[PDB]
Design a protein around this motif. Structure first.
Motif, PDB file in Angstrom:
ATOM      1  N   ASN A  19     -10.488   2.071 -24.872  1.00 46.84           N
ATOM      2  CA  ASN A  19      -9.220   2.761 -24.614  1.00 46.84           C
ATOM      3  C   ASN A  19      -9.275   3.535 -23.295  1.00 46.84           C
ATOM      4  O   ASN A  19      -8.338   4.252 -22.947  1.00 46.84           O
ATOM      5  CB  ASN A  19      -8.896   3.705 -25.768  1.00 46.84           C
ATOM      6  CG  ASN A  19      -8.427   2.980 -27.007  1.00 46.84           C
ATOM      7  OD1 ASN A  19      -9.063   2.997 -28.074  1.00 46.84           O
ATOM      8  ND2 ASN A  19      -7.293   2.356 -26.878  1.00 46.84           N
ATOM      9  N   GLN A  20     -10.386   3.386 -22.568  1.00 48.99           N
ATOM     10  CA  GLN A  20     -10.508   3.877 -21.207  1.00 48.99           C
ATOM     11  C   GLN A  20     -11.645   3.091 -20.572  1.00 48.99           C
ATOM     12  O   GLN A  20     -12.273   2.277 -21.235  1.00 48.99           O
ATOM     13  CB  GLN A  20     -10.784   5.386 -21.166  1.00 48.99           C
ATOM     14  CG  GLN A  20     -12.134   5.796 -21.767  1.00 48.99           C
ATOM     15  CD  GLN A  20     -12.303   7.292 -21.755  1.00 48.99           C
ATOM     16  OE1 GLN A  20     -12.224   7.939 -20.697  1.00 48.99           O
ATOM     17  NE2 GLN A  20     -12.527   7.862 -22.933  1.00 48.99           N
ATOM     18  N   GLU A  30      -3.553   9.195 -22.124  1.00 47.56           N
ATOM     19  CA  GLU A  30      -3.965   7.816 -22.320  1.00 47.56           C
ATOM     20  C   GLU A  30      -3.995   6.975 -21.097  1.00 47.56           C
ATOM     21  O   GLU A  30      -3.357   7.267 -20.071  1.00 47.56           O
ATOM     22  CB  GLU A  30      -3.368   7.091 -23.525  1.00 47.56           C
ATOM     23  CG  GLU A  30      -2.143   6.279 -23.247  1.00 47.56           C
ATOM     24  CD  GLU A  30      -0.944   7.182 -23.179  1.00 47.56           C
ATOM     25  OE1 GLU A  30      -1.044   8.307 -23.734  1.00 47.56           O
ATOM     26  OE2 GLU A  30       0.081   6.776 -22.577  1.00 47.56           O
ATOM     27  N   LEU A  72     -10.435  10.339 -20.603  1.00 45.17           N
ATOM     28  CA  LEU A  72      -9.518  10.942 -21.552  1.00 45.17           C
ATOM     29  C   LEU A  72      -9.986  12.359 -21.846  1.00 45.17           C
ATOM     30  O   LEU A  72     -11.177  12.583 -22.072  1.00 45.17           O
ATOM     31  CB  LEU A  72      -9.476  10.125 -22.839  1.00 45.17           C
ATOM     32  CG  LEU A  72      -8.906   8.704 -22.719  1.00 45.17           C
ATOM     33  CD1 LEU A  72      -8.873   8.005 -24.063  1.00 45.17           C
ATOM     34  CD2 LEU A  72      -7.516   8.717 -22.099  1.00 45.17           C
TER      35      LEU A  72
END
Ligand SMILES: Cc1cn([C@H]2C[C@H](N=[N+]=[N-])[C@@H](CO)O2)c(=O)[nH]c1=O
Ligand SMILES: Cc1cn([C@H]2C[C@H](N=[N+]=[N-])[C@@H](CO)O2)c(=O)[nH]c1=O
Lengths: 440, 440
Positions: free
Chosen positions: A243-244, A353, A389
């Motif tokens: 997610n990153q 995000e 994040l």
């Protein structure tokens, strides 16, 4: 007869295919007697009807056996043959440290890896930033390197699971990539051709992962673990976060730099460390080089701390025809970009995000990846100093530092980076880097 | 972009395709930019998900428009453009009488027909038993014949619905023939390219039919009627019987002989008569040449009785470069077989069922049809004097008379005929020759 159309029909109508039928079909793909249309038709019947565990195993074994399968027994090595495969991501540079780390702890790692795909980087493309580095050693030379160094990272030759080559090429233009049994068989046809004792799978979760939901990531992991263990290779999988960006960098030369600096202890992204270590621990345990997590971690930490893993990486680079002083003098060898300049967010706030697919595509668009196979990579471009994040960004903390091939290029990349990242007035809820481990 | 894979994906996931998407895909098949794999994948998604009426119409129209479409308006003819298509069978020689009959009643019949397929005979192969008969007149010559004679029966040129050619060729090796929307679109892409006012469909039922159940025959008929009328062509369908040979003969020359003898009134198989007449009645009514069944039948009977239909057939044969005295002297022209000999059943009894697929394959095996496209037909071989369901067979009534190319050939054919036919001590329950008519 002949059977190919009958086999498609049988699967079309919801019947399980026999091992014989699957082997016949895969062999027909191999010898070019089964056409693209017939491959696509079968692929689509599998998309609709799925495959049972026995079918999945048959399909995997058949594809594995369609080409050269490596055997190590005759080298009389004193350690396990072990490897890792990732579904891919952005900053997913784990292999460059993990191979040397596990080798330094007694493993033998014949890593057949891959180039970038879609939004994801590729280990082979990253390694080709190293001048002279040869991903295609001959069969005998590869064996020497594995014996002497413990690890090598190489490309897929024409002799590797050739039936998978045609199967995947057809899948990728017929909307039949997205099938758990087909993906599992494709991945394992290649990895199992390495003649492994043990394997760890890194299945990514999140916006930069290929599988679009946690549940589907999980199902793929379960499929791969079941099939691989069914084939006699001790296998586990970790579901890990994408997610990153995983590393603090994304690109080719920039990620090799990060790998070297990780190995020497200059800098270690903690999330990249967590994933790298967790995957290495699986390999040591599955390969019977350690009895538990704590012992595995102690051994892996030791080879980081004493310089052994860095030394193995250096020896690997030299053995694959890169420079002999690469670890020491990487700055001399890795190409630098024309323009390196930070990109700052338009406002202050917390990074909340980051569309990691979009970040991946931004690197491709800069020239650090390909849209078609003939595309030429600029090995210097990409991102460093990635914000994570939860980071507060402002005039003193950019979203990233962009390494660009010229100023127009930089502007488009800066635009894409800003578009991919949303800020918030509060930090987002933290997430594990490793969600779950799946075993037989 | 490009769209082809996106279109497959959309259909794969159960969404209806737009007219635009269907037209794009069909055009890509036409210009060879969409691959066999992509055709097969789409075909299989249609097999699984079907197509709505709008999709079916779009697909049909797109395929029709992929090549030459005939237009008759400029000839200023005073009658309707009308045709018949059969799903095929054994002894299904209706077209050779029906074309001339309807032409003699004021219709214009530009019949693009076909060769044998699987177990079924083909009108074009039957006509090619006639020496000189040319199924490929040039565009202008075809128009002259239609104007002057009223009917011609010709083959499918490279310019006819070329997208269907590749679509069907792929379907036939990927188990995607068996799909109502695909069959409907394929049939009508060709027939509608004739520029028709009206069409009748003969959908066969029974052991010699391609559709394996009455219900599936019925569904196909319904699909074709709906799509064709949707396209502005007045269309009906008859479901007709193929649980035995329709004519009293099966082959090529032997069926042409039967056609001639039907037209001259020497001999008329009553079941062949019933189907032929019923199909002709549909054409006259749809083509507005008659207001009701009774009037249609009266007009059709009249052209049989007064020799006009026979004369039209003769003129058609002459115009297509067959002999000018063919009706009169057919015996001189149609090739005779080396050996002609009756096959008798092993016991006495009533013919109770006849595997009409097996009878069809027996003719292929004799050399009267093809297993692959390159095969050469022997135009003389086949069956005459076919026994019918309900016939008492004994030493005085054979199952058939076999026309064979040599004695070894005859023995294998006799064996197949006997194997295809079951006798019983009672006659089977009679069945209609025409089960049902389907209209818009
Ligand atoms: C390169 C390659 C990718 N793939 C699949 C893996 C990826 N899915 N996941 N996780 C997918 C990305 O399009 O392609 C495959 O099945 N075989 C291959 O050889
Ligand atoms: C020759 C041909 C057959 N077919 C189908 C019609 C037949 N089905 N029915 N009724 C089927 C026989 O294999 O092939 C087709 O869709 N297009 C074609 O061009």
């Amino acid at each position: 007869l002949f059977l190919a159309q009958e086999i498609i029909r049988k699967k079309r109508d919801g019947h399980a295919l026999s091992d014989e039928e699957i082997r016949f079909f895969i062999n027909g793909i191999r010898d070019n007697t089964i056409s693209e249309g017939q491959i696509a038709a079968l692929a689509m019947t599998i998309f609709f009807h799925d495959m049972t565990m026995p079918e999945r195993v048959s399909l995997t074994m058949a594809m594995r056996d369609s080409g050269t399968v490596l055997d190590w027994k005759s080298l009389h090595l004193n350690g396990p043959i072990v490897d890792k495969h990732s579904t891919g991501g952005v900053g997913d540079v784990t292999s460059l440290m993990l191979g040397p780390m596990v080798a330094a702890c007694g493993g033998y790692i014949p890593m057949i890896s891959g180039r970038g795909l879609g939004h994801t980087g590729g280990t082979l493309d990253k390694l080709e930033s190293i001048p002279g580095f040869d991903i295609f050693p001959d069969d005998n030379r590869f064996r020497e390197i594995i014996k002497d160094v413990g690890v090598a990272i190489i490309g897929q030759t024409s002799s590797l699971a050739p039936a998978d080559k045609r199967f995947y090429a057809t899948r990728d233009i017929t909307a039949t990539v997205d099938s758990i049994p087909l993906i599992t068989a494709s991945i394992l046809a290649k990895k199992l051709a390495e003649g492994l004792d043990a394997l760890v799978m890194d299945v990514k979760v999140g916006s930069g992962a290929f599988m679009p939901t946690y549940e589907l990531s999980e199902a793929l992991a379960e499929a791969i673990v079941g099939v691989a263990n069914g084939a006699g290779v001790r296998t586990t999988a970790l579901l890990t976060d994408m997610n990153q960006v995983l590393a603090s960098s994304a690109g080719n030369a920039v990620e090799v730099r990060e790998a070297v600096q990780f190995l020497t202890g200059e800098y270690r992204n903690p999330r990249l460390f967590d994933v790298t270590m967790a995957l290495c621990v699986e390999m040591l345990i599955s390969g019977k080089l350690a009895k538990d997590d704590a012992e595995a971690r102690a051994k892996l930490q030791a080879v980081l701390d004493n310089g052994k893993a860095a030394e193995v990486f250096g020896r690997m680079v030299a053995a694959q025809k890169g420079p002999t002083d690469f670890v020491e003098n990487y700055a001399k060898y890795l190409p630098t970009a024309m323009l390196t300049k930070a990109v700052y967010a338009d406002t202050e706030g917390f990074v909340s995000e980051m569309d990691t697919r979009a970040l991946g595509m931004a690197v491709v668009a800069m020239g650090g990846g390909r849209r078609q196979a003939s595309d030429t990579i600029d090995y210097s471009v990409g991102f460093t100093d990635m914000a994570r994040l939860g980071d507060q960004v402002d005039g003193q903390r950019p979203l990233a530092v962009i390494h660009a091939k010229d100023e127009n290029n930089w502007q488009e990349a800066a635009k894409a980076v800003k578009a991919a990242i949303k800020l918030a007035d509060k930090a987002p809820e933290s997430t594990p880097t490793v969600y779950r481990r799946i075993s037989e």
